[PDB]
Design a protein around this ligand. Structure first.
Ligand SMILES: *[C@@H]1O[C@H](CO)[C@@H](O)[C@H](O)[C@H]1NC(C)=O
Ligand SMILES: *[C@@H]1O[C@H](CO)[C@@H](O)[C@H](O)[C@H]1NC(C)=O
Ligand SMILES: *[C@H]1O[C@H](CO)[C@@H](O)[C@H](O)[C@H]1NC(C)=O
Lengths: 182, 214
């Protein structure tokens, strides 16, 4: 056999928002990421924590330099702020949707930049704050970002769901609707 | 449990001069400035042969990179050159990056080969039609293959015997972000009596193929 894999250490620092990021990718999936604020390693899947350990200070230090560099870079190009590339959204179930059996709706915001979005899940018109989770800003092969959003939902014949994505590159927030169909 | 994961260390970019800018889009666009970097450890066959590739961005474009194969930084665009030249003049830095194929790329592989590499999860295979009532075009036989990992897999729809190599509407490999894939391989057909459809799924968590007739 032959093992083909790619580990990526992606980090960034973004102004004006003053928000950085330091994470590792394994064949496309987040191995983990550091919480630059709380200063802690957040494995993608908790089971990982029992196999490796990343001293979260390490990240904080690199972001410190990436903070510096951005001021260098921003000066080297006349503080010319590039354009904003509106993200592409798509709501899909995490597994086959049977009526009554718990599932999850994945809200995949893809191909965007800058790395900042406002995503909202709506169940039957109202915003849902419980049973919702999101991933950090994930890398792509290119220079753009993708980021996943999840909402635990009970496959009902009565409901409907929406994902609302608002990005500095959209005229009006985007809203993809999902809804059981049978 | 293995060792502690290493990371690539960031270097301050010597400011440099100033380049006369190309442009920036507006019209519903707010000003932003992003310094972004990607250090890609590429393993062709485990740690046998590895290729490092550090890619420095800035806003919407890659402007400088460090290929293992080339051995020095290269300007991808003009904005990156001031750096490519400076870092390239720092002999000590150039060896650092050069040693990173090891101190970082391999050191971390080795660790990850213990849990990440061998991670396997069998796919829950599922067959069913999208039977409406009319349509005429005919409701496609949906072979949903969910929750599997690694990505690579092969899902084949068979028409009673032979590999019905056509009308295979597919989603392709979908990635959920929680380390689980899935894919629906839908067959466009007209379900009729005396004929059972089959879904043959081969995967690195399956010694033998999973087949679901319908
Ligand atoms: C890949 O590496 C393994 C050991 O890690 C060994 O079989 C050989 O070096 C390579 N195998 C193939 C099939 O290339
Ligand atoms: C150039 O960079 C300066 C930073 O001092 C900024 O104020 C100005 O708007 C930029 N554009 C031009 C055309 O000078
Ligand atoms: C919505 O999010 C922020 C607050 O988190 C708000 O100030 C801004 O108008 C919107 N952000 C984006 C990235 O569009």
């Amino acid at each position: 056999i032959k093992e083909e894999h790619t580990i990526i250490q992606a980090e960034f620092y973004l102004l004006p928002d003053k928000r950085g990021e330091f994470m590792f990718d394994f064949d496309g999936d987040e191995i983990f990421h550091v919480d630059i604020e709380k200063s802690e390693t957040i494995w993608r899947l908790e089971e990982f924590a029992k196999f490796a350990s990343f001293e979260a200070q390490g990240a904080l230090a690199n972001i410190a330099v990436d903070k510096a560099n951005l001021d260098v870079m921003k000066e080297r190009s006349n503080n010319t702020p590039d354009a904003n590339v509106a993200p592409e959204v798509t709501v899909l179930s995490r597994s086959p949707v049977n009526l009554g059996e718990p599932n999850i709706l994945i809200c995949f915001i893809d191909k965007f930049s800058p790395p900042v979005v406002n995503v909202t899940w709506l169940r039957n018109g109202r915003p849902v704050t419980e049973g919702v989770s999101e991933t950090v800003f994930l890398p792509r092969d290119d220079h753009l970002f993708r980021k996943f959003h999840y909402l635990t939902f009970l496959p009902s014949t009565d409901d409907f769901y929406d994902c609302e994505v608002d990005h500095w590159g959209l005229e009006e927030p985007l809203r993809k609707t999902w809804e059981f169909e049978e | 449990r293995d060792r502690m994961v290493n990371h690539f260390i960031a270097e301050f970019k010597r400011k440099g001069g100033s380049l006369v800018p190309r442009g920036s889009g507006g019209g519903g666009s707010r000003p932003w400035f992003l310094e972004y970097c990607k250090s890609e450890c590429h393993f062709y066959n485990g740690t046998q042969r590895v290729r490092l590739l550090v890619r420095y961005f800035y806003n919407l474009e890659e402007n400088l990179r460090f290929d293992s194969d080339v051995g020095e930084f290269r300007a991808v665009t003009e904005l990156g050159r001031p750096d490519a030249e400076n870092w390239n003049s720092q002999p000590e830095f150039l060896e650092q990056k050069r040693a990173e194929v090891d101190t970082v790329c391999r050191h971390n592989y080795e660790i990850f080969d213990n849990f990440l590499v061998p991670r396997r999860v069998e796919p829950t295979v599922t067959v069913y039609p999208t039977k409406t009532q009319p349509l005429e075009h005919h409701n496609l036989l949906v072979c949903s293959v969910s929750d599997f990992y690694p990505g690579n897999i092969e899902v084949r729809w068979f028409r009673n015997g032979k590999e019905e190599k056509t009308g295979i509407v597919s989603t392709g490999l979908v990635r959920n972000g929680d380390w689980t894939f899935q894919t629906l391989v839908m067959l466009e057909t007209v379900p009729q009596s005396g004929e059972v459809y089959t879904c043959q799924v081969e995967h690195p968590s399956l010694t033998d193929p999973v087949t679901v007739e319908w």
